[PDB]
């Protein structure tokens, strides 16, 4: 048909359960490549011994369920979809 990329949006997210980790083989681990950029050191607290900073953070991973072929989708490469509509890693900071 011809609604274009909207089709894609359906096709991927139709039965997609965002609770299960996106791997066809459960034994296969999902690798998250991360990136940290220091924007500013906001404040150091010498008394309470606590540092407050601002970071630009980048997360890259592989969603094995959200894969498709560019063809028969009008040669679409990438698609912008809501963050909270897909599985997301729970990476945090210990400090």
């Amino acid at each position: 048909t011809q609604p274009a990329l909207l089709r894609l949006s359906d096709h991927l997210l139709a039965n997609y359960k965002k609770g299960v980790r996106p791997v066809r083989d459960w034994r296969k681990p999902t690798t998250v490549s991360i990136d940290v950029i220091m924007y500013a050191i906001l404040n150091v607290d010498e008394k309470n011994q606590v540092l407050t900073t601002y970071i630009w953070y980048r997360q890259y991973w592989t969603d094995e369920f959200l894969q498709w072929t560019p063809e028969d989708f009008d040669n679409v490469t990438k698609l912008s979809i809501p963050t909270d509509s897909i599985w997301v890693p729970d990476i945090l900071i210990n400090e």
Partner: nanobody
Amino acid sequence: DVQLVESGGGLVQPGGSLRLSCAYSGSLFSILRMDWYRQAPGKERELVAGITRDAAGYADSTNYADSVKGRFTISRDSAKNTVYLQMNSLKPEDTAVYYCNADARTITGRADYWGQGTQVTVSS
């Protein structure tokens, strides 16, 4: 894995002009640097032109070899996903196979990618 496709190569008389196009494609990639290479029969690989964004994150910065210093002009179109090489006053010594080398970063990591290259023959 980003794929590169060269095009525009052909036969031209000396002193003529020819425009080469290199089209990149893939899934998730970031072209950090794009170089043009040429290889004459028997001769080594020669660096022709390159392009990379400046320290200021707006205007680009080109890099030319002493050989093609004045004749060649490398440009790009992010919208058309294609990097161009404008060859003016082609010499018979400029005759070679022109590849394009893209230093790109993917989910796998930072790596170099090469195209199939196009034949550029300058003869009378």
